[PDB]
PDB file of C-alpha atoms in Angstrom:
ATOM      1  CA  UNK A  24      58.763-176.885  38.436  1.00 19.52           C
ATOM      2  CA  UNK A  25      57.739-179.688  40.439  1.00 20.34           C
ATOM      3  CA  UNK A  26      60.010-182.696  39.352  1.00 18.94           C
ATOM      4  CA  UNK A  27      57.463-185.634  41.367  1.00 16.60           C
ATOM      5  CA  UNK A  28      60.360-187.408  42.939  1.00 19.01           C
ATOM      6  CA  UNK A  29      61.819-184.604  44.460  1.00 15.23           C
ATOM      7  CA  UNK A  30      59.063-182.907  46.280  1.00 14.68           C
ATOM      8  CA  UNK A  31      58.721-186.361  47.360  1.00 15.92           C
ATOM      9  CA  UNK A  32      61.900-186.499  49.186  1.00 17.65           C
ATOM     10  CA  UNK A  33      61.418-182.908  50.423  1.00 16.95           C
ATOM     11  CA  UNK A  34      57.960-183.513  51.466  1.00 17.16           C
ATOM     12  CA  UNK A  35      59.736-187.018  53.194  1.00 19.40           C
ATOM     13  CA  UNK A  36      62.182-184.649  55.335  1.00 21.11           C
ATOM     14  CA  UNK A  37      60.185-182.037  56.501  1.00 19.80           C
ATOM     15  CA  UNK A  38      56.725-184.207  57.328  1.00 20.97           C
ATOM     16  CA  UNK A  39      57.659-188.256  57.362  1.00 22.72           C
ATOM     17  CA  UNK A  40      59.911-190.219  59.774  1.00 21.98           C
ATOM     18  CA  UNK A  41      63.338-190.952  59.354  1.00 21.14           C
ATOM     19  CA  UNK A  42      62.140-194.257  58.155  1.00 20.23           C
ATOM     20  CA  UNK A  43      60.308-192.716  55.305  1.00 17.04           C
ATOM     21  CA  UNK A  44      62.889-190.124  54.400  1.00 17.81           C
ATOM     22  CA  UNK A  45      65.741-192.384  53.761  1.00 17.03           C
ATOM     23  CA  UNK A  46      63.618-194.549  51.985  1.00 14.29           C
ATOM     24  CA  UNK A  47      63.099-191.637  49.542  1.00 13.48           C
ATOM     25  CA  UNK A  48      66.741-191.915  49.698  1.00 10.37           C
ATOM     26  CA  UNK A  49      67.399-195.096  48.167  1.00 10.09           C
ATOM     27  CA  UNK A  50      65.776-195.124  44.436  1.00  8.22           C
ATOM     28  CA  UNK A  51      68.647-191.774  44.063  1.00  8.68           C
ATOM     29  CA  UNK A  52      71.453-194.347  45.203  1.00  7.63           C
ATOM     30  CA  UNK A  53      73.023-191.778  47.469  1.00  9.71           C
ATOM     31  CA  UNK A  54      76.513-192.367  48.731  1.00 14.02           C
ATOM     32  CA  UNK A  55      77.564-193.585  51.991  1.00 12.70           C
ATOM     33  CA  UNK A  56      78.297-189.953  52.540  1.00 17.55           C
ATOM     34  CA  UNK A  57      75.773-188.377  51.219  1.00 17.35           C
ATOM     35  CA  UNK A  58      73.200-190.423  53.153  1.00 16.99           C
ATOM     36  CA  UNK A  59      75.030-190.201  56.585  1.00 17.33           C
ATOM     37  CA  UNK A  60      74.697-186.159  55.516  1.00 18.70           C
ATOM     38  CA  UNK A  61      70.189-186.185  54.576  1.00 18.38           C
ATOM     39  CA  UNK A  62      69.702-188.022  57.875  1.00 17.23           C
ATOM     40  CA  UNK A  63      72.015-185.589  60.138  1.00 18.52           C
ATOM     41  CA  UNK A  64      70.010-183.139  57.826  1.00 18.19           C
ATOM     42  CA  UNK A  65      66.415-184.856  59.275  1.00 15.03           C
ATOM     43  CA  UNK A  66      67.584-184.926  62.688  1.00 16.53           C
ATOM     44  CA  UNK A  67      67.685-181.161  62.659  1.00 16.03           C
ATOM     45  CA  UNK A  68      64.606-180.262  60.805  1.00 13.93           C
ATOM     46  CA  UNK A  69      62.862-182.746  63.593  1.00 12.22           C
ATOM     47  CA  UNK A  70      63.989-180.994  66.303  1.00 12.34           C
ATOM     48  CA  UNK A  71      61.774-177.798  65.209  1.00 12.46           C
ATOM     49  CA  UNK A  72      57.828-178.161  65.906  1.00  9.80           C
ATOM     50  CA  UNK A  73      55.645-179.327  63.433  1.00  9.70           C
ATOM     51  CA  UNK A  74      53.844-176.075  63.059  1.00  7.52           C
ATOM     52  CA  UNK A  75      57.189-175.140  62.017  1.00  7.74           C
ATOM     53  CA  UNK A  76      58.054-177.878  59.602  1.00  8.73           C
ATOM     54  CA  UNK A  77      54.707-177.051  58.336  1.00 12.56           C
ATOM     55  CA  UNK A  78      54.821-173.683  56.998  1.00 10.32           C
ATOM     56  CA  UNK A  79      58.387-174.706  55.577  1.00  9.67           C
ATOM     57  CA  UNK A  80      55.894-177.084  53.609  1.00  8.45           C
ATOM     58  CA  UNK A  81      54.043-173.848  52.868  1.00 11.47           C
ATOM     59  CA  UNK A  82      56.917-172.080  52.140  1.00 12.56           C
ATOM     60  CA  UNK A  83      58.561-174.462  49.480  1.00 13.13           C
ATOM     61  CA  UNK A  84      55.225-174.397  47.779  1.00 12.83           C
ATOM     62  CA  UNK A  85      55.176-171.012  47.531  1.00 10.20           C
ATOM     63  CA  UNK A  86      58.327-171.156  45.411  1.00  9.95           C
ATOM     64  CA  UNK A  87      58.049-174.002  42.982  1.00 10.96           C
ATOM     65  CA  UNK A  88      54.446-173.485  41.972  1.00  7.48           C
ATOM     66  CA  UNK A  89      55.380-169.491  41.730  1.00  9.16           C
ATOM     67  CA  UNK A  90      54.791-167.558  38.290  1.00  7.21           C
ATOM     68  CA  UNK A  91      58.522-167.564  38.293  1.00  7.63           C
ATOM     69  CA  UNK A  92      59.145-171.380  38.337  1.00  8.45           C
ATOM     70  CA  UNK A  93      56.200-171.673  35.857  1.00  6.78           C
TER      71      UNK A  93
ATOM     72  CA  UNK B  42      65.780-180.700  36.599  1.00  7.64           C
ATOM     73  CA  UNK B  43      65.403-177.645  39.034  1.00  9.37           C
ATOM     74  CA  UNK B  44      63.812-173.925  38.810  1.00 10.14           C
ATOM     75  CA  UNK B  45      66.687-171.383  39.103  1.00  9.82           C
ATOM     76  CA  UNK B  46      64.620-168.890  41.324  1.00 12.49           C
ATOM     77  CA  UNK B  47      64.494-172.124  43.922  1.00 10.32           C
ATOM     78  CA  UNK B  48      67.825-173.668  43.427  1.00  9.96           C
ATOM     79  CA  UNK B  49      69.056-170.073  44.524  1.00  8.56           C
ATOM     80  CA  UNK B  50      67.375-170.340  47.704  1.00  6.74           C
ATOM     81  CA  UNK B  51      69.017-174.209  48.338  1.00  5.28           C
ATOM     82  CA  UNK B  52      72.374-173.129  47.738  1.00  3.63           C
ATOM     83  CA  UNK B  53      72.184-169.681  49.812  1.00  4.60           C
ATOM     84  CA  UNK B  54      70.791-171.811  52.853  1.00  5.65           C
ATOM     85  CA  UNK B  55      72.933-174.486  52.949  1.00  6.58           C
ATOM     86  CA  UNK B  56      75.812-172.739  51.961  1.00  6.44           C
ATOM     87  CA  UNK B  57      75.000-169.099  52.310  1.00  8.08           C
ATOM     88  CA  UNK B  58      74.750-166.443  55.720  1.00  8.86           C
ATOM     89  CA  UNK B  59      71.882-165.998  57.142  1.00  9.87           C
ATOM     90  CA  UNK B  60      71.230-162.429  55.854  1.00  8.56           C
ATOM     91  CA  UNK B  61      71.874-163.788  51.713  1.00  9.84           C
ATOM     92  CA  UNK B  62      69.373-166.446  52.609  1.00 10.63           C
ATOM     93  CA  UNK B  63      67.190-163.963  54.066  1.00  9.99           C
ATOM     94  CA  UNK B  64      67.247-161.879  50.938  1.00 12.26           C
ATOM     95  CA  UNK B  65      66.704-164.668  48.915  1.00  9.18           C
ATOM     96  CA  UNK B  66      63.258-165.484  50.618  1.00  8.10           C
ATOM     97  CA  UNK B  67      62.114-161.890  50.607  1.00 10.31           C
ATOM     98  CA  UNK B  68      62.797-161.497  46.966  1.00 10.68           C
ATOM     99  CA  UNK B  69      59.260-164.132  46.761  1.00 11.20           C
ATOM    100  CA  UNK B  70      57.682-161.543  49.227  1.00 12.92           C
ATOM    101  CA  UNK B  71      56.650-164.260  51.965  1.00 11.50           C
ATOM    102  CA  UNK B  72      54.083-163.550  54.279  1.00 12.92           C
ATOM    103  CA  UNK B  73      56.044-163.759  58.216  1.00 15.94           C
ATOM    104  CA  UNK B  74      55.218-166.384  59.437  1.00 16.48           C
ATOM    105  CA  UNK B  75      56.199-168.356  56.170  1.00 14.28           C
ATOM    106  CA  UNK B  76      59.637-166.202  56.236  1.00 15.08           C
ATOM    107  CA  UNK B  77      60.059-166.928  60.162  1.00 16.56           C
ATOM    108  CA  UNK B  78      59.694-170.238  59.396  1.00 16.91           C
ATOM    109  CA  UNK B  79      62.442-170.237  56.492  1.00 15.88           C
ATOM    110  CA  UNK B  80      64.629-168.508  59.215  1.00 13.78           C
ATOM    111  CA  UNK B  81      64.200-171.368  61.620  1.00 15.12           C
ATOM    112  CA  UNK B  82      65.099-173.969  58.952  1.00 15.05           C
ATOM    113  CA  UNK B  83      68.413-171.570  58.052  1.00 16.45           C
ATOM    114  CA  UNK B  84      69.268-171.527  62.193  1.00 13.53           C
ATOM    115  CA  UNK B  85      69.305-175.179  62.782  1.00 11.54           C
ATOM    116  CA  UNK B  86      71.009-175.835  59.231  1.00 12.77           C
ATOM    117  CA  UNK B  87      73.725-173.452  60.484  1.00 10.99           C
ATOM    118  CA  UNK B  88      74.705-176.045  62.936  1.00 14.03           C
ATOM    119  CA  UNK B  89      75.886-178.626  60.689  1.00  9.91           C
ATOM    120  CA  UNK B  90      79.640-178.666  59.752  1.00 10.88           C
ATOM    121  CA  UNK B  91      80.291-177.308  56.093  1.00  9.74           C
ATOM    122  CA  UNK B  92      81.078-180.896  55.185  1.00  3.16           C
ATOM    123  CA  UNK B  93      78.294-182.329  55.995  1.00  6.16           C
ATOM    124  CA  UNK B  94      76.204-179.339  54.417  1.00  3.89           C
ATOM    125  CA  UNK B  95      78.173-179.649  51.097  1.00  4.47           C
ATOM    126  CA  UNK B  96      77.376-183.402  51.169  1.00  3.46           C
ATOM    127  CA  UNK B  97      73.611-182.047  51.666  1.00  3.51           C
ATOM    128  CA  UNK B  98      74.636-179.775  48.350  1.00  6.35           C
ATOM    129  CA  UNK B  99      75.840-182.927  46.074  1.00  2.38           C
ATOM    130  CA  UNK B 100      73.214-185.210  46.859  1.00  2.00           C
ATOM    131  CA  UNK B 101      70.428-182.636  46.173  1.00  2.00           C
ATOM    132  CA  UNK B 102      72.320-182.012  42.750  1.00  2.00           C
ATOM    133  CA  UNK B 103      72.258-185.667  42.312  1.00  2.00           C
ATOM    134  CA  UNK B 104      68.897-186.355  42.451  1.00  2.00           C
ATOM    135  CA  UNK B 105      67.776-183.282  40.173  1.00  2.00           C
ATOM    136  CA  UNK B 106      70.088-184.619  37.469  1.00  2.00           C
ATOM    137  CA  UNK B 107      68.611-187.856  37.706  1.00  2.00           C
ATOM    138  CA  UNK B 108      67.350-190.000  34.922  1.00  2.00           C
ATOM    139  CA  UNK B 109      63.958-189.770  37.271  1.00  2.00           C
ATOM    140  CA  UNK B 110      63.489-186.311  37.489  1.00  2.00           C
ATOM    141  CA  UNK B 111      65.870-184.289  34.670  1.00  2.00           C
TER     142      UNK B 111
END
């Protein structure tokens, strides 16, 4: 159940820049709020290594592309 | 829109315990270093005030209810 635009923002916040994620942002036309919230959100997910980040990327596939989201 | 199975798994990490979220990934039978992973993501998450985590929970309900994906 990949809905494009969505794994595109996930795929934004775990791999792209800040830049790039709140650019996904913007065609959604998240709140004030709500985008202060995605890029406190990105600040965290940065701090972890990229290994890490990775196999989150990994992960998340595993799930929406499972038998059970078929 | 969104797959159940994985909206589960959004809601228990940004608004769960650790240990629901843990169940949650374990129910997809992840190999460890993909679960290890997820339980980095759920650490970091965990130090984000529920506001801000809620606002995470709204704007990812948002976008699946767009026009553009659902």
């Amino acid at each position: 159940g990949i809905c494009p635009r969505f794994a595109h923002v996930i795929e934004n916040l775990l791999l792209g820049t800040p830049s790039s994620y709140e650019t996904s942002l913007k065609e959604f036309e998240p709140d004030d709020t709500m985008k202060d919230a995605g890029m406190q959100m990105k600040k965290v997910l940065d701090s972890l290594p990229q290994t890490t980040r990775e196999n989150i990327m990994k992960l998340t596939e595993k799930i929406v592309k499972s038998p059970l989201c078929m």
